[PDB]
């Protein structure tokens, strides 16, 4: 049944980064993979992610959040970077394994 | 299948003429072909006063013979669609012809007439003089060259090998009809010559033509004596030609090599294949297997770099040459030396396995045509004392394993004092000492 869904949706609301208007992927720590990934994002998606963040920072400095209306909703969160990120990791795991070879 | 194609390759026939000259050939189905004489003469054989003769000669070899002057000679060659070319290195000169298998015998006659009866017209000599002088001024702008000569110049400083194949400026400006004459009579002799043929030709019909135009039999024993050359001494040192006005800098570094004979040359090559080469237009870019090429790309270390294993009768140069911007010379050299050290210490079977396949395709690539096959024969005999088949080579190459490469490289690379040649805006690359210390510890 829908347990995993209930949970995920819960934890999602629990974390509460949407309160800042951030997407899940907007919060990823920028390790090496994530870094390559972002470099592959289309000009627009990248600028949109950029503003989203700078917005959230200005909020954190102000010690505020977005009004309930603007919070990102669990199912309207677009996972824009994950497709790319997984590839970057695929490519690497390939290279990685191939060099031990 | 590989394994076999290596055997079905027609064997190379070799029969010596009672005058000292050797005849050899690989007969193929090809309608067209190539044949020439590979003389064991060079700049190494030149003395300090006749430096450049073998080159001034290379220049008059086609300006006519006695049996037929310039116009006629040229006309006769062109009109049969044959291509007459040749060259001259430090330990090897060669004049070969590319023609249809038909003209095979009328060709041999030509070759012969060139070596034995070069006209040396007093008037043609005063022209080839200003001509060579230009080629010296044009070649003086080919950094890659100005660099290898400089490498030798110091590598074998104080000996013959430390000489340019073109010779000094004074020698060009003064060499006489005499010395030229002399050089030919002293060096272009049957015991020191090989008539190599590759293409659709019958060893027979070839060997005969030689007997006919390659007569002049020797009386004394000294005429059958292949003179041994005085050894050239290697010296770890450096020569730095600085000109910050040059666009990019050139750096060539090397250790002394074994010499044609030594079986290690095989291993050495496998090694060189592991380090390979690179230039800004290699499409593999950052994914190239050669670690040095990789870093070269990642850090934009050089415009191009190459490993080389120049061999000689009794010695050799083993090293690398890279072209780079004034401000990356240092990192480049650093990564390069590093790779060398990696060779003597941690080469993997993975690297060698690949290096072998590259070398195999490399050797086969040197027999892609009659000229290249003829060149290989002309040089094999002259240098190796016979011809080594691709089947033989391949065995010697499958014999190499990582462990083998390390021992051989350590043997010739590790802790040796190298010879260094730097040209251009070389301020960043520095200190022989520092470079010397780069010769040890991976």
């Amino acid at each position: 049944g829908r347990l995993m869904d209930r949970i995920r949706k819960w934890y999602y609301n629990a974390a509460g980064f949407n309160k800042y208007g951030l997407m899940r992927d907007d919060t990823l720590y920028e390790d090496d993979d994530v870094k390559e990934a972002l470099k592959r994002l289309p000009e627009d998606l990248y600028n949109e992610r950029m503003f989203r963040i700078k917005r959230a920072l200005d909020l954190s400095l102000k010690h505020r959040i977005l009004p309930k209306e603007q919070w990102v909703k669990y199912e309207e969160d677009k996972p824009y970077l994950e497709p790319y990120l997984k590839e970057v990791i695929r490519e690497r795991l390939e290279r990685e394994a191939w060099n031990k070879k | 299948t590989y394994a076999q194609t290596l055997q079905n390759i027609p064997e190379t026939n070799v029969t010596t003429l009672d005058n000292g000259l050797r005849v050899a050939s690989e007969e193929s189905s090809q309608p067209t072909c190539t044949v020439g004489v590979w003389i064991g003469a060079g700049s190494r054989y030149e003395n300090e006063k006749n430096n450049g003769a073998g080159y001034f000669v290379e220049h008059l070899a086609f300006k006519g013979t006695k049996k037929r002057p310039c116009a006629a000679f040229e006309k006769e060659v062109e009109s049969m669609g044959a291509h007459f070319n040749g060259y001259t290195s430090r330990e090897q000169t060669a004049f070969y012809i590319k023609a249809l298998s038909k003209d095979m015998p009328k060709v041999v006659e030509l070759l012969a007439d060139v070596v034995q009866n070069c006209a040396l017209e007093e008037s043609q000599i005063e022209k080839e003089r200003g001509v060579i002088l230009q080629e010296l001024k044009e070649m003086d702008n080919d950094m890659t060259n100005v660099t290898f000569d400089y490498l030798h110049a110091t590598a074998f400083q104080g000996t013959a090998l430390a000489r340019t194949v073109e010779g000094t400026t004074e020698n060009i400006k003064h060499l006489t009809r005499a010395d030229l004459a002399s050089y030919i009579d002293t060096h272009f002799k049957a015991p020191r010559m090989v008539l190599a043929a590759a293409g659709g030709i019958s060893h027979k019909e070839l060997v005969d033509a030689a007997r006919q135009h390659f007569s002049g039999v020797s009386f004394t024993y000294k005429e059958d004596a292949v003179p041994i050359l005085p050894r050239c001494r290697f010296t770890g040192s450096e020569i730095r030609a600085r000109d910050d006005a040059l666009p990019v800098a050139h750096v060539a570094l090397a250790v002394e090599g074994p010499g044609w004979a030594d079986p290690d040359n095989v291993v050495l090559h496998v090694a060189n294949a592991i380090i390979g080469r690179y230039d800004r237009t290699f499409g593999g870019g950052k994914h190239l297997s050669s670690r040095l090429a990789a870093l070269a790309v990642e850090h934009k270390l050089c415009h191009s770099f190459q490993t080389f294993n120049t061999s000689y009768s009794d010695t050799g140069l083993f090293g690398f040459h890279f072209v780079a911007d004034p401000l990356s010379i240092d990192d480049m050299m650093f990564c390069a030396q590093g790779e060398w050290m990696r060779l003597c210490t941690s080469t993997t079977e993975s690297e060698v396995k690949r290096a072998k396949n590259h070398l195999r395709s490399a050797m086969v690539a040197q027999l892609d045509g009659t000229t290249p096959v003829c060149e290989t024969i002309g040089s094999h005999l002259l240098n190796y004392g016979r011809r080594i088949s691709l089947e033989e080579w391949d065995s010697r190459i499958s014999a190499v394993d990582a462990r083998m490469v390390r021992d051989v490289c350590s043997k010739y690379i590790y802790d040796k004092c190298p010879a260094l040649a730097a040209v251009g805006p070389i301020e960043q690359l520095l200190d022989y000492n520092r470079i010397r210390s780069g010769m040890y510890w991976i």
Binding site: - | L295, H299, L301, D331, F334, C335
Partner: protein, 54 residues
């Protein structure tokens, strides 16, 4: 950076002031006192501490 000597925030310091540091080819013996002075210092401080302990 290729070699961890010029990239590391510290090894780059040791290196860029005592190893890849550009120095005149002719500085004489009268240029040795800078280092002696340094060394000298490190030594006083060491002997001094040892004494201050008693």
């Amino acid at each position: 950076a290729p070699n961890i000597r010029k990239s590391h925030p510290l090894l780059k310091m040791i290196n860029n002031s005592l190893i890849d540091l550009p120095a005149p080819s002719n500085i004489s013996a009268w240029w040795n006192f800078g280092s002696l002075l340094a060394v000298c210092l490190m030594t006083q401080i060491l002997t001094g501490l040892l004494l201050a302990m008693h």
